[PDB]
Design an enzyme around this catalytic site. Structure first.
Site, PDB file in Angstrom:
ATOM      1  N   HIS A 134      39.593  21.667  29.534  1.00  0.00           N
ATOM      2  CA  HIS A 134      38.963  21.745  30.888  1.00  0.00           C
ATOM      3  C   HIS A 134      38.232  20.448  31.252  1.00  0.00           C
ATOM      4  CE1 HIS A 134      39.524  26.140  30.408  1.00  0.00           C
ATOM      5  NE2 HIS A 134      39.861  25.998  31.689  1.00  0.00           N
ATOM      6  N   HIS A 190      42.907  17.726  33.364  1.00  0.00           N
ATOM      7  CA  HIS A 190      43.230  19.062  33.945  1.00  0.00           C
ATOM      8  C   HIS A 190      43.021  19.056  35.460  1.00  0.00           C
ATOM      9  CE1 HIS A 190      43.574  23.327  34.496  1.00  0.00           C
ATOM     10  NE2 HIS A 190      42.306  23.450  34.817  1.00  0.00           N
ATOM     11  N   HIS A 247      37.802  21.951  40.842  1.00  0.00           N
ATOM     12  CA  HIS A 247      37.778  23.426  40.630  1.00  0.00           C
ATOM     13  C   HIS A 247      37.142  23.766  39.291  1.00  0.00           C
ATOM     14  CE1 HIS A 247      41.303  22.867  38.174  1.00  0.00           C
ATOM     15  NE2 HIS A 247      41.079  24.068  37.704  1.00  0.00           N
ATOM     16  N   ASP A 248      37.052  22.823  38.342  1.00  0.00           N
ATOM     17  CA  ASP A 248      36.457  23.092  36.999  1.00  0.00           C
ATOM     18  C   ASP A 248      35.285  22.130  36.700  1.00  0.00           C
ATOM     19  OD1 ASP A 248      37.709  25.388  35.709  1.00  0.00           O
ATOM     20  OD2 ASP A 248      39.445  24.138  35.203  1.00  0.00           O
ATOM     21  N   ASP A 274      46.542  26.097  38.689  1.00  0.00           N
ATOM     22  CA  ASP A 274      45.631  26.110  37.525  1.00  0.00           C
ATOM     23  C   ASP A 274      46.434  26.346  36.251  1.00  0.00           C
ATOM     24  OD1 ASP A 274      43.170  25.874  36.321  1.00  0.00           O
ATOM     25  OD2 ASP A 274      42.757  28.049  36.576  1.00  0.00           O
ATOM     26  N   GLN A 331      51.409  33.833  23.483  1.00  0.00           N
ATOM     27  CA  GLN A 331      51.989  33.120  24.671  1.00  0.00           C
ATOM     28  C   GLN A 331      52.986  34.044  25.415  1.00  0.00           C
ATOM     29  OE1 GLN A 331      51.334  29.886  26.255  1.00  0.00           O
ATOM     30  NE2 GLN A 331      49.469  30.719  25.332  1.00  0.00           N
TER      31      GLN A 331
HETATM   32  C1  LIG Z   1      46.837  35.976  26.995  1.00  0.00           C
HETATM   33  N1  LIG Z   1      46.955  35.417  25.641  1.00  0.00           N
HETATM   34  C2  LIG Z   1      46.880  36.081  24.470  1.00  0.00           C
HETATM   35  C3  LIG Z   1      47.058  35.156  23.356  1.00  0.00           C
HETATM   36  C4  LIG Z   1      46.973  35.331  21.797  1.00  0.00           C
HETATM   37  C5  LIG Z   1      47.008  34.164  20.986  1.00  0.00           C
HETATM   38  C6  LIG Z   1      46.883  34.208  19.538  1.00  0.00           C
HETATM   39  C7  LIG Z   1      46.736  35.408  18.926  1.00  0.00           C
HETATM   40  C8  LIG Z   1      46.732  36.603  19.726  1.00  0.00           C
HETATM   41  C9  LIG Z   1      46.807  36.565  21.159  1.00  0.00           C
HETATM   42  N2  LIG Z   1      47.237  33.945  23.880  1.00  0.00           N
HETATM   43  C10 LIG Z   1      47.188  34.035  25.271  1.00  0.00           C
HETATM   44  C11 LIG Z   1      47.357  32.787  26.154  1.00  0.00           C
HETATM   45  O1  LIG Z   1      46.236  32.681  27.013  1.00  0.00           O
HETATM   46  C12 LIG Z   1      46.238  31.738  27.975  1.00  0.00           C
HETATM   47  N3  LIG Z   1      45.164  31.760  28.898  1.00  0.00           N
HETATM   48  C13 LIG Z   1      45.121  30.865  29.860  1.00  0.00           C
HETATM   49  N4  LIG Z   1      44.003  30.896  30.861  1.00  0.00           N
HETATM   50  C14 LIG Z   1      43.684  29.714  31.701  1.00  0.00           C
HETATM   51  C15 LIG Z   1      42.617  28.614  31.240  1.00  0.00           C
HETATM   52  O2  LIG Z   1      41.553  29.437  30.495  1.00  0.00           O
HETATM   53  C16 LIG Z   1      41.638  30.895  30.505  1.00  0.00           C
HETATM   54  C17 LIG Z   1      42.860  31.543  30.740  1.00  0.00           C
HETATM   55  C18 LIG Z   1      46.189  29.911  29.861  1.00  0.00           C
HETATM   56  C19 LIG Z   1      46.474  28.908  30.711  1.00  0.00           C
HETATM   57  N5  LIG Z   1      47.590  28.282  30.340  1.00  0.00           N
HETATM   58  N6  LIG Z   1      48.027  28.934  29.258  1.00  0.00           N
HETATM   59  C20 LIG Z   1      49.218  28.581  28.537  1.00  0.00           C
HETATM   60  C21 LIG Z   1      47.160  29.904  28.933  1.00  0.00           C
HETATM   61  N7  LIG Z   1      47.229  30.827  27.925  1.00  0.00           N
HETATM   62 MG   LIG Z   2      38.338  27.329  35.771  1.00  0.00          MG
HETATM   63 ZN   LIG Z   3      41.269  25.114  35.732  1.00  0.00          ZN
END
Ligand SMILES: Cn1cc(-c2ccccc2)nc1COc1nc(N2CCOCC2)c2cnn(C)c2n1
Ligand SMILES: [Mg+2]
Ligand SMILES: [Zn+2]
Length: 313
Positions: free
Chosen positions: A68, A72, A106-107, A217, A269
């Site tokens: 962040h 970004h 935005h961040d 984002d 992912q």
């Molecule tokens: C939902 N989830 C669950 C698990 C997981 C991993 C290891 C063990 C078990 C579960 N990994 C994810 C990926 O989460 C996620 N959140 C994002 N957000 C945007 C920026 O900040 C908050 C949210 C973004 C943005 N770009 N990408 C790729 C992102 N990936």
């Molecule tokens: Mg943000």
């Molecule tokens: Zn952002």
């Protein structure tokens, strides 16, 4: 007035594509942004001296966190540039102005921690802003920088145009709180399918701009696989630091934030693509057909994470 920014040939061509990566040369990112304002908005949108002073104050108020950060900010602004440039006539003069600024801001002053961690830590920002905690802070920092002497890039707008642009920026920044995306996208889904979606309805445009903000984002998932995969490392570096900080407050973090559960990243992912990213880019593409390349890149990246799970990489 006669002073264009011009990029080397490879950047001049590739900056137009959704999947462009702004590169590792930090000193070229301001120029890439001004370039995008000039083409998206006009050479007349902003006084160059004010705009340059604004950009450098915005940069200074991003922190040296793994994901962040200033890169970004500029990356998210480029995805917006690409959406705006592929949808020339759909957006007002004020929207083109507000939305690149909103993406750059935005961040602002992000510390690398979720709204949840701020609330569990009992950070002062959690008392000041009970929901969309960091996003209300990002908007607060944007108004602060706009009020520095010599930084009011909107000074030539009438009073009501000024109120409108700051309201576009506020809504766009709040919309980057992913907690708000789920319901925004559902409402857009229903509106598109029942055919009630109306781009002259301000409440509808607000919703469509919110979804654009989510799409910009999350745009790491719309890059070529090597960019996607290397950006994922930065995203997880923050999640795992947050997880460490949760364990210091005596709270088991969710698996996504537990570095002991690195093995589960590929399956995590997948859920992210299926629950957040693919739905986001599908509804965006239904509303704004020329954003389809974002959905196609997202689907390619989903298939690459599927390949990682099958041990084919
Ligand atoms: C939902 N989830 C669950 C698990 C997981 C991993 C290891 C063990 C078990 C579960 N990994 C994810 C990926 O989460 C996620 N959140 C994002 N957000 C945007 C920026 O900040 C908050 C949210 C973004 C943005 N770009 N990408 C790729 C992102 N990936
Ligand atoms: Mg943000
Ligand atoms: Zn952002």
């Amino acid at each position: 007035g006669l002073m264009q920014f011009t990029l080397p040939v490879r950047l001049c061509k590739e900056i137009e594509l959704f999947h462009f990566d702004i590169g590792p040369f930090e000193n070229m990112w301001p120029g890439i942004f001004v370039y995008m304002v000039h083409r998206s908005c006009g050479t007349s949108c902003f006084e160059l001296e004010k705009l340059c002073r604004f950009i450098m104050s915005v940069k200074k108020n991003y922190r040296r966190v793994p994901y962040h950060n200033w890169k970004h900010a500029v990356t998210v602004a480029h995805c917006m540039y690409a959406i705006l440039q592929n949808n020339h006539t759909l957006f007002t003069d004020l929207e083109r102005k507000g939305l690149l600024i909103a993406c750059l801001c935005h961040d602002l002053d992000h510390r690398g921690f979720s709204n949840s961690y701020l609330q569990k830590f009992d950070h002062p920002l959690a008392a000041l802003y009970s929901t969309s905690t960091m996003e209300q802070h990002h908007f607060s920092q944007t108004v602060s920088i706009l009020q520095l002497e010599g930084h009011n890039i909107f000074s030539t707008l009438s009073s009501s145009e000024y109120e409108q642009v700051l309201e576009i920026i506020r809504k766009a920044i709040i919309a980057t709180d992913l907690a708000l995306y789920f319901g925004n996208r559902k409402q857009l889904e229903e509106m598109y399918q029942t055919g009630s979606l109306n781009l002259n309805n301000q409440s509808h445009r607000d919703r469509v701009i919110g979804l654009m903000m989510t799409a910009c984002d999350l745009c790491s998932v719309t890059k070529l696989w090597p960019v996607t995969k290397l950006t994922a490392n930065d995203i997880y570096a923050e999640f795992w630091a947050e997880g460490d900080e949760m364990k210091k407050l005596g709270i088991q973090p969710i698996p996504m934030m537990d570095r002991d559960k690195k093995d589960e990243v590929p399956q995590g992912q997948l859920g992210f693509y299926n629950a957040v990213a693919i739905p986001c880019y599908t509804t965006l593409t239904q509303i704004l057909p020329p954003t389809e390349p974002l959905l196609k890149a997202c689907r390619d990246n989903l298939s690459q994470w599927e390949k990682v799970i099958r041990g084919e990489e």
